[PDB]
Amino acid sequence: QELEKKWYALQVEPGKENEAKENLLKVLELEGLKDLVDEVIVPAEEKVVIRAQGKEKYRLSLKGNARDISVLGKKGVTTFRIENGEVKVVESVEGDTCVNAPPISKPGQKITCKENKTEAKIVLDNKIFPGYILIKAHMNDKLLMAIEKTPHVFRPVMVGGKPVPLKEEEVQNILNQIKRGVKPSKVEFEKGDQVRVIEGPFMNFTGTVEEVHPEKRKLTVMISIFGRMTPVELDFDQVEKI
């Protein structure tokens, strides 16, 4: 078989992750190291942002099934097509030559339709761990020196003055993290739930949840103070379902 490569987190200048990646690739070329590296990734998600006369209309993942998107501009309609990680103008108003513009595929890139006043640009969103890029490679001294000599790159994460490998799962999870649509913080507590106050002056009294407040972690509980129904504001952590 073939010797497997490992993942390593590099440390680079925040906000220039894409630049550091481009820089690195170029350096791998000149130093004849390209074969030691199978991947260079910026922990983020590429997205297409479509605008119409200043206003943002859409923000969609670059990756996905072929999709067409039409937007009303000044003079009329412009339709963009996103497929195979590229974006182009399918058709725009009379006069817009953007329809001939070659498809874009990299962050920072853009196609503008001056007539319809429409445009689509590739950007990066969900960029967690800014100031880091990930490379799958076969580490060695030359590669290291090359990484360190690359403009906008500091050096890989060092443990014992030596690059430290990441687990495939760690990386995969990071990538899965990058691109999922963060559902609600669970739904423990919903109107009607019967609870017992476990902390504070209302401790041991029971009642029912009248209104939840997920974005504040508080509840409006109608507490039965021995029949004397009293609505009280409590924190999720000072009551218990029952």
Side-chain angles (χ1 to χ4, degrees):
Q1 257 294 60
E2 294 176 293
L3 203 179
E4 288 178 55
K5 299 184 184 62
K6 300 175 178 181
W7 289 101
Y8 301 83
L10 298 211
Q11 273 197 302
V12 313
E13 282 183 59
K16 280 147 171 52
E17 298 81 16
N18 269 139
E19 285 97 332
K21 171 180 176 174
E22 291 310 303
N23 285 26
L24 184 56
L25 301 176
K26 283 178 163 58
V27 163
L28 296 170
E29 179 68 58
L30 297 178
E31 309 290 318
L33 301 172
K34 306 182 297 178
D35 200 51
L36 298 178
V37 190
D38 293 324
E39 281 176 287
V40 183
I41 302 307
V42 177
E45 174 172 39
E46 305 178 306
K47 287 194 174 170
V48 181
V49 178
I50 296 173
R51 304 179 58 183
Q53 312 189 81
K55 315 295 77 62
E56 181 170 305
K57 290 294 186 170
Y58 297 98
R59 189 170 286 266
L60 317 163
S61 308
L62 185 56
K63 177 186 67 60
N65 300 313
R67 291 156 290 165
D68 269 38
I69 306 81
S70 302
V71 284
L72 269 185
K74 180 184 295 297
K75 302 184 176 182
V77 173
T78 302
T79 303
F80 304 84
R81 178 173 297 162
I82 307 178
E83 90 186 312
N84 299 151
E86 299 177 65
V87 189
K88 58 178 183 178
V89 175
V90 173
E91 57 97 65
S92 189
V93 175
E94 165 59 48
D96 265 326
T97 187
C98 49
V99 187
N100 294 301
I104 60 185
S105 62
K106 303 154 175 125
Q109 279 194 286
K110 175 188 66 182
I111 296 173
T112 294
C113 299
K114 288 285 282 57
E115 305 289 53
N116 221 43
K117 297 299 180 181
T118 61
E119 75 165 59
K121 67 168 178 290
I122 302 181
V123 309
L124 284 183
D125 271 35
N126 311 350
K127 185 201 297 188
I128 55 185
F129 307 128
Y132 283 100
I133 63 177
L134 305 168
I135 65 175
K136 191 168 185 183
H138 179 279
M139 189 61 60
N140 62 350
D141 298 306
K142 282 209 61 176
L143 180 57
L144 228 178
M145 301 180 266
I147 294 165
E148 283 187 33
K149 58 191 271 65
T150 301
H152 294 321
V153 180
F154 302 116
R155 68 195 81 252
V157 174
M158 296 298 181
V159 162
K162 194 68 181 177
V164 48
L166 269 40
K167 295 193 176 71
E168 181 66 35
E169 59 175 298
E170 296 188 292
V171 175
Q172 289 305 317
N173 290 305
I174 282 178
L175 301 178
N176 298 326
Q177 197 64 38
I178 299 300
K179 54 110 187 230
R180 259 170 158 291
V182 294
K183 285 87 173 306
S185 303
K186 306 141 70 175
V187 187
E188 290 179 350
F189 296 149
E190 43 189 290
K191 167 188 279 293
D193 289 321
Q194 289 181 174
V195 300
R196 189 205 319 290
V197 176
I198 56 186
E199 275 184 38
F202 293 104
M203 191 187 289
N204 300 318
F205 280 113
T206 62
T208 54
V209 189
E210 300 290 68
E211 182 180 61
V212 188
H213 312 298
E215 281 84 295
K216 189 122 301 301
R217 303 189 69 56
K218 282 188 179 297
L219 296 177
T220 301
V221 178
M222 188 55 90
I223 294 178
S224 166
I225 302 171
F226 292 123
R228 199 279 187 190
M229 310 322 293
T230 309
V232 184
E233 293 293 310
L234 297 159
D235 293 304
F236 281 40
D237 58 52
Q238 42 197 191
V239 298
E240 61 181 358
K241 274 172 186 186
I242 58 184

